[PDB]
Amino acid sequence: PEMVRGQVFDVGPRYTNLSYIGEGAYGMVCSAYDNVNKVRVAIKKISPFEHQTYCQRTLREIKILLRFRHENIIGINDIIRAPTIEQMKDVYIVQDLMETDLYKLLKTQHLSNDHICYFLYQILRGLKYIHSANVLHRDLKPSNLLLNTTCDLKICDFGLARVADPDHDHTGFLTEYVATRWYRAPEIMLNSKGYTKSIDIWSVGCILAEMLSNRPIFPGKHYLDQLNHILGILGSPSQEDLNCIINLKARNYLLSLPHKNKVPWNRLFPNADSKALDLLDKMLTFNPHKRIEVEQALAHPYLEQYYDPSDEPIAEAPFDDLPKEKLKELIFEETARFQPGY
Ligand SMILES: Clc1ccc(-c2n[nH]c3c2CCCC3)cc1
User: Fold this and answer.
1) Active-site annotation holder among 101, 139, 200, 241
2) Ligand 1: residues within 6 Å at CB?
3) Is 139 a catalytic residue?
4) In the chain, how many domains are there?
5) Mind giving me the DSSP string for 191-254?
6) Domain hosting residue 201, numbered range
């Protein structure tokens, strides 16, 4: 079995000439030569069978990526695992090798307006397909956007994804949340479980702002600081936007704050294209109900060079009290189609 900078990475005879890329949530990431297709691929080693939450996230992601088929969504090319449940300790997910991610790119590269425009179009095109499947990504951020050498973009990491549930989205003030703090919509900290499509649009708005200046727009250092960062730019919510918040604790918190004025987008981003800032404003709308939807954003004048609804496909059909033993068995059965026996 092949070994990489420490431990076992046995991807069989098919995948050879391994190189360490980095580290994922449940294990090591490597590049490898696929001897069948004759191209270098990405391979993620996943070891989740000890913790049922890690099992839930692995299963949920495998299920979604196997049903999804879209140019702007990372596919699963192959899954490597032992022939029996007893011998299966790890799972290897084989995917297209990409050059970088938008996180790494933004740390050192200034994006031209043309690159921002194309990247945003591909994010929203992939997001249109996800939302058409009644799925919410819920963790969109630059490190979950993969890019190859020709700037083709693919959304990855569906570990926190859920089926949209708008009628059961309400919760109390300060409800604990899992997704990356800086890309969290303001309603998460007030009265939302993040079960509505509008939560993803907020994250895309944050990514767009980050592509414009190479810095996260709302870098909250803790749970409530996140909301303070958002309000420091959007300013105080209007009476109408406050009246939409029925939760008394959440509404009174906002009422307790001194008045804050809106920071104009053109002063925050003085070299940005005016149409980019108009779309940014609509994505970073405080009120989730007034926030632009994915199809409206694709139809915005900023994306006119790319918009083609007939070339922006949708999913063919819409898409945690289960023990780790049942989940391992479900992971085993979900990955069966890649076993050589067929
Ligand atoms: Cl530097 C870099 C970053 C990401 C990838 C990559 N390419 N393809 C994938 C990944 C990461 C894990 C998901 C699938 C390759 C090189």
Assistant:
1) 139
2) 21, 29, 42, 44, 74, 95-98, 100-101, 146, 156
3) yes
4) 2
5) TB-S-STHHHHHHHHHHHHHHHHSS-S---SSTTHHHHHHHHHH-SPPHHHHHT---HHHHHHH
6) 98-320
